[PDB]
Amino acid sequence: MSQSNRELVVDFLSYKLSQKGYSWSQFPMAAVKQALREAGDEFELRYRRAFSDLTSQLHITPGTAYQSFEQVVNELFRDGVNWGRIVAFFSFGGALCVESVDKEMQVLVSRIAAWMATYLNDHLEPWIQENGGWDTFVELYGN
């Protein structure tokens, strides 16, 4: 569902910005949020590169349009959707927000959240609903 997914993005990015010492101002669900926060932390511990290729492939400016974001995020899903790649997506968004703030383009982090919502609702929800919904995500990743 569209509205839950906006909340979920904003939670994950607010969590990452907080965690890495940044402002988050420029913006059962609680189980899904906790599980997703933990999943992103584990993911980033294993893979440390922070999607440096994908982020420079994107080359994000305020002139950058959703279609460009979409093209680059599709790289994560060249072999289709799985749970791991959904976590990577949330982690990629987080890395982009960090980059945006470091480059003094705080304006992009609310735009990135909207892009992530649209992309999640459009390309990922169809697979999530097929494979047991966010209940399955929690079953799989949650404490």
From Swiss-Prot:
Motif (BH4): 4-24
Similarity section: Belongs to the Bcl-2 family.
Protein's UniProt name: Bcl-2-like protein 1
One of the protein's GO biological processes: response to cytokine
Source species, domain of life: Eukaryota
Motif BH1 boundaries: 75-94
Effect after changing D122A: No effect on caspase-1 cleavage
Gene Ontology CC, one term: mitochondrial inner membrane
Subunit structure: Homodimer. Interacts with BCL2L11. Interacts with BAD. Interacts with PGAM5. Interacts with HEBP2. Interacts with p53/TP53 and BBC3; interaction with BBC3 disrupts the interaction with p53/TP53. Interacts with ATP5F1A and ATP5F1B; the interactions mediate the association of isoform Bcl-X(L) with the mitochondrial membrane ATP synthase F(1)F(0) ATP synthase. Interacts with VDAC1. Interacts with BCL2L11 (via BH3). Interacts with RNF183. Interacts with GIMAP3/IAN4 and GIMAP5/IAN5.
GO molecular function, one term: protein kinase binding
Domain notes: The BH4 motif is required for anti-apoptotic activity. The BH1 and BH2 motifs are required for both heterodimerization with other Bcl-2 family members and for repression of cell death.
Modifications the protein undergoes after translation, according to the UniProt entry: Proteolytically cleaved by caspases during apoptosis. The cleaved protein, lacking the BH4 motif, has pro-apoptotic activity. This phosphorylation is partial in normal mitotic cells, but complete in G2-arrested cells upon DNA-damage, thus promoting subsequent apoptosis probably by triggering caspases-mediated proteolysis. Phosphorylated by PLK3, leading to regulate the G2 checkpoint and progression to cytokinesis during mitosis.
Organism: Homo sapiens
Motif (BH3): 32-46
UniProt motif BH2: location: 126-141
Tissue specificity: Bcl-X(S) is expressed at high levels in cells that undergo a high rate of turnover, such as developing lymphocytes. In contrast, Bcl-X(L) is found in tissues containing long-lived postmitotic cells, such as adult brain.
Function: Potent inhibitor of cell death. Inhibits activation of caspases. Appears to regulate cell death by blocking the voltage-dependent anion channel (VDAC) by binding to it and preventing the release of the caspase activator, CYC1, from the mitochondrial membrane. Also acts as a regulator of G2 checkpoint and progression to cytokinesis during mitosis.
UniProt keyword terms in alphabetical order: Apoptosis, Cytoplasm, Cytoplasmic vesicle, Cytoskeleton, Endocytosis, Membrane, Mitochondrion, Mitochondrion inner membrane, Mitochondrion outer membrane, Nucleus, Phosphoprotein, Synapse, Transmembrane, Transmembrane helix, Ubl conjugation
